[PDB]
């Protein structure tokens, strides 16, 4: 849910943000069948 214009949260605030007039698409699927604490994100 963070991966959109006009959202907020640790990713949407500190790591990776889309412009308020972003022109495109977001695509997702679960990766549990491939993924193991190897993936990191920003908290400060």
């Amino acid at each position: 849910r963070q991966i959109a214009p006009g959202q907020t949260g640790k990713i949407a605030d500190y790591n990776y943000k889309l412009p308020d007039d972003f022109t495109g698409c977001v695509i997702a699927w679960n990766s549990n069948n491939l993924d193991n604490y190897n993936y990191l994100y920003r908290l400060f």
């Binding site: 214009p5 006009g6 907020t8 308020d20």
Partner: protein, 49 residues
């Protein structure tokens, strides 16, 4: 006639200034509230109103 023309100019400017106090359906009529209470992507819809 002259006092009427002065009164019409006064009523027009007085109305025009009073409109700043009105919401037009925004969350506040104080522009500085909208710009501080809400985040810009949310706030812009109220400000555009």
């Amino acid at each position: 006639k002259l006092q009427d023309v002065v009164n019409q100019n006064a009523q027009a400017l007085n109305t025009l200034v009073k409109q700043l106090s009105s919401n037009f359906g925004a969350i506040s009529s104080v522009l500085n509230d909208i710009l501080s209470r809400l985040d810009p992507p949310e706030a812009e819809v109220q400000i555009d109103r």
